[PDB]
Copies of this chain bind each other. A is one copy, B any other.
Amino acid sequence: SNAMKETHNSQDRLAYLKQQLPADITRSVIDTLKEDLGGTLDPAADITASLIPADRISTATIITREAGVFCGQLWADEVFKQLGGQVSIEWHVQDGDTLTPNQTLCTLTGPARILLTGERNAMNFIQTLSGCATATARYVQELKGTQCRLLDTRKTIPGLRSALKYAVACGGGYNHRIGVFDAYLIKENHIIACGGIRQAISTAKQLNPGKPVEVETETLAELEEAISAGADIIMLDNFSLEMMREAVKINAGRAALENSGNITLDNLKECAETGVDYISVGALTKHLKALDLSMRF
């Protein structure tokens, strides 16, 4: 079925993402350390840490004061590798694990100056990615009892697209297109330009074979036309609950239906209960509620 086919598209995207992550992790980490150190990757630039003896070895633990879902160990590991690799980390949690208040995330051991310099940077990644995974899981809870799945969007904090799409995955959400290069999102503008939905879809399939094709519809008539034109996925743009139920009944399980627009944590369940297959939520990646962490020596 088309709904199950989208689950396959989501896994293909997560695969592309995992393949690109090492490079993206290195890039964000370097830029973050550079900003903190003042344009250099030399940890000796941390003036306060220099008040500690050069030879001191210390052990610290990072703890979450809040419940949620963990994400970010790969980024925290890279922070310490970029600082020289002298600090070793024992992780007590894995990406995607549920966290309870005051749970220990990891234990770090190495030169005290390095731990001091890397601590905030490592925590800034963890709190951000964990924050996104945590928000995602809260949204996913609203779908209980339905077969509906949550999708992310292109409304992401700049520089962290791949990290946030990964955190969404860690929180139980699914990935929609990574960018404008991996899937088509056909809208009214494109439909008019090509002279009809079937023509737009055909052009899309001829220009980039294999790329998923999604069509945005604003009315039931458009939906019906997109379904008739064989569309893979149909995005329902600002549909009322009534229109959603009607769309689901009209569709009869043919295409994958995805609702988009003005979705809040407070009305997500009601949207899912109409029978739509997916709900896209820009709030998962456009907003951020960082997980509160503490580092103790």
Q: Is the CB of A158 within 8 A of B159?
A: yes
Closest to A35 in B: B161
Contacting A180 at CB < 8 Å: which of B36, B158, B289?
B36
Instruction: Collect the chain B residues with CB atoms within 8 Å of residue A123's CB.
Output: 155
- Kindly supply a per-residue 1/0 record for chain A positions 12-37, scoring 1 wherever the CB is within 8 Å of any chain B CB and 0 otherwise: 00001000100010011101100111
Instruction: Collect the chain B residues with CB atoms within 8 Å of residue A91's CB.
Output: none
Instruction: Collect the chain B residues with CB atoms within 8 Å of residue A158's CB.
Output: 28-29, 31-32, 75, 121, 124-125, 128, 159-160
Q: Using known A-B contacts A47-B208, A51-B204, determine if residue A124 contacts B156 with beta carbons closer than 8 Å.
A: yes
Q: Is A290 among interface residues, defined by CB-CB distance under 8 A?
A: yes
Q: Is A254 among interface residues, defined by CB-CB distance under 8 A?
A: no
Instruction: Collect the chain B residues with CB atoms within 8 Å of residue A211's CB.
Output: 47
Q: Is A101 among interface residues, defined by CB-CB distance under 8 A?
A: no
We find that the number of chain A residues with CB closer than 8 angstroms to chain B is 70
- A199-252 at interface with B (beta carbon < 8 Å): 200, 203-204, 207-208, 211
Instruction: Collect the chain B residues with CB atoms within 8 Å of residue A38's CB.
Output: 16, 178-179, 181-182
How many copies the complex holds: the figure is: 2
Q: Is the CB of A162 within 8 A of B48?
A: no
Instruction: Collect the chain B residues with CB atoms within 8 Å of residue A50's CB.
Output: 207
Contacting A289 at CB < 8 Å: which of B39, B160, B287?
B287
Cβ of A146 to closest chain B Cβ, rounded Å = 27
Which interface residue of A29, A159, A287 has the most chain B CB atoms within 10 A? A159
Contacting A207 at CB < 8 Å: which of B32, B47, B181?
B47
A125 to B286, CA, bound (A): 10
Instruction: Collect the chain B residues with CB atoms within 8 Å of residue A145's CB.
Output: none
Interface residues of A (CB under 8 A from B): 16, 20, 24, 27-29, 31-32, 35-39, 45-53, 56, 75, 112, 116-117, 120-121, 123-125, 127-128, 131, 154-162, 178-187, 189-190, 193-194, 200, 203-204, 207-208, 211, 286-290, 297
Closest 7 CB pairs of A and B: A38-B181, A159-B159, A35-B161, A46-B180, A36-B179, A288-B288, A32-B158
Besides A27-B31, A116-B189, 5 other CB < 8 A contacts?
A35-B179, A37-B180, A49-B180, A51-B204, A127-B286
A-B contact list, 5 entries, CB within 8 Å: A24-B35, A29-B158, A51-B193, A127-B155, A288-B288
